[PDB]
Amino acid sequence: ELLKKLLEELKG
């Protein structure tokens, strides 16, 4: 769920 958080903050 780091991939999850990171993933939500990432561009397009």
PDB file of C-alpha atoms in Angstrom:
ATOM      1  CA  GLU A   1       0.000   0.000   0.000  1.00  0.00           C
ATOM      2  CA  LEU A   2       2.959   2.325  -0.589  1.00  0.00           C
ATOM      3  CA  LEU A   3       2.472   1.540  -4.283  1.00  0.00           C
ATOM      4  CA  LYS A   4      -1.148   2.546  -3.664  1.00  0.00           C
ATOM      5  CA  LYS A   5      -0.413   5.849  -1.988  1.00  0.00           C
ATOM      6  CA  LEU A   6       2.414   6.686  -4.411  1.00  0.00           C
ATOM      7  CA  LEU A   7       0.190   5.657  -7.306  1.00  0.00           C
ATOM      8  CA  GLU A   8      -2.557   8.122  -6.245  1.00  0.00           C
ATOM      9  CA  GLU A   9      -0.220  11.075  -6.081  1.00  0.00           C
ATOM     10  CA  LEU A  10       1.335  10.393  -9.491  1.00  0.00           C
ATOM     11  CA  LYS A  11       0.625  12.314 -12.660  1.00  0.00           C
ATOM     12  CA  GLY A  12      -1.879  11.210 -15.285  1.00  0.00           C
TER      13      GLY A  12
END
